[PDB]
Structures are given as structure tokens and as C-alpha cells.
Amino acid sequence: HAGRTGYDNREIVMKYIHYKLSQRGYEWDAGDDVEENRTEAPEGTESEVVHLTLRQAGDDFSRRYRRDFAEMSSQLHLTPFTARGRFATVVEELFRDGVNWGRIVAFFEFGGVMCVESVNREMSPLVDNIALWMTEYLNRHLHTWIQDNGGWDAFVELYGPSMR
Numbered sequence: 077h078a079g080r081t082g083y084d085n086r087e088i089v090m091k092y093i094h095y096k097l098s099q100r101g102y103e104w105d106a107g108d109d110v111e112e113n114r115t116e117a118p119e120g121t122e123s124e125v126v127h128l129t130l131r132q133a134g135d136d137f138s139r140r141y142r143r144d145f146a147e148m149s150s151q152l153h154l155t156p157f158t159a160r161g162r163f164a165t166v167v168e169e170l171f172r173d174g175v176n177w178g179r180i181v182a183f184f185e186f187g188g189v190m191c192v193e194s195v196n197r198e199m200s201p202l203v204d205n206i207a208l209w210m211t212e213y214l215n216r217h218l219h220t221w222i223q224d225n226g227g228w229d230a231f232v233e234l235y236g237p238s239m240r
């Protein structure tokens with residue numbers, strides 16, 4: 077009794093972040109389990125529509141705010157110990173009062189911003205860790221907000237591309 081797409085907070089973040097790194101050409105060792113996993117074929121026209129919307133959603137945002145999160149990035153600093161604690165401290169501010177499709181878009185960007193921050197130095201593997209925490213906060217907050225507010229289909233339906 078919950079759609080038939082199987083959207084996974086982990087997968088969505090893994091794809092979005094995976095694309096961000098692709099732009100640079102970094103073969104992010106995401107699917108460490110590279111043993112040919114079919115299960116039910118890669119075909120996912122269902123979650124495919126939102127994959128583009130959500131993927132493009134962040135891009136359009138980053139282009140609008142090119143002097144907000146970029147600066148705060150310097151505050152994050154560079155370290156594996158504080159990195160994990162800094163993430164939660166940042167997202168916490170993303171939604172002080174309440175959550176909304178409008179604010180969540182910034183959520184994805186954050187991960188990508190902090191993710192690349194590690195790659196810039198020499199902590200590519202860390203990119204995987206970030207995604208782990210991202211899904212936690214997204215599933216522990218957003219998920220509940222989206223699930224109660226229609227769901228994923230809402231975002232894509234509300235913010236749908238031209239025609240299709």
C-alpha cells in the first residue's frame with residue numbers, strides 16, 4: 077500500500093550525487109557490488125520522471141544562488157571527524173520552522189557541495205559516507221513530510237517539465 081516504484085532515499089541520493097561527480101569524470105566507487113545485479117531490470121520509467129526533475133531541480137537552484145552555500149562551504153572546513161558533525165549542523169538550519177518542497181531542493185545541493193569538498197582534497201571514498209547521512213536526514217524528516225503530503229508524485233506533478 078505505497079506506490080509501485082520502490083523509491084529509495086538512498087538510491088535517489090546515490091544517483092543525484094553520482095551525476096555530480098560524473099561531470100568531473102571521477103569514477104566514484106558507488107555500486108561496490110559490481111556483480112551484475114538485475115533483480116527486476118534497470119527499467120524504471122516510474123522513478124525515471126522524478127529522477128530528471130529532482131536532478132535538474134538542484135542544478136536550477138545552484139545557478140540561482142551562486143553566493144550563499146558556496147561561501148558557507150568554507151566554514152565546513154576539512155576533516156573526517158567534524159565532517160560528520162558539520163553535516164547535521166547544516167541541514168538542521170535548512171529547515172528551522174518546517175519542511176517544504178521548496179526547501180528540500182537545497183538539501184540535495186548540500187550533499188553535492190560537501191561531497192565534492194572531500195574530492196577536492198583526497199577523500200573521494202567519503203562521498204559514499206555523505207550519501208549515507210543524507211538518506212538518514214531525508215528519510216527521518218523529508219520522507220515523513222512527503223509521505224503525508226501526497227508523496228514523490230506530488231513534486232513531479234507540481235513541478236513537471238514542459239508538457240511531459
Ligand SMILES: O=C(NS(=O)(=O)c1ccc(NCCSc2ccccc2)c([N+](=O)[O-])c1)c1ccc(-c2ccc3sc(CCc4ccccc4)nc3c2)cc1
Nearest residue numbers: 132133136137145170177178179181182183185186189235
Ligand atoms: O525558493 C525556494 N524554494 S521554492 O520557491 O519553493 C521552489 C522554486 C522552484 C523550484 N523548481 C524550479 C525548477 S529547478 C529549481 C529547484 C529549486 C530551487 C530553484 C529552482 C522548486 N522545486 O523544484 O522544488 C522550489 C528556496 C529559496 C531559498 C532556499 C534557501 C535559502 C538559503 C539557504 S542556506 C541552506 C543550508 C542548506 C544548503 C547547503 C548547501 C546548498 C544548499 C542548501 N539552505 C538554504 C536554502 C530554499 C528554497
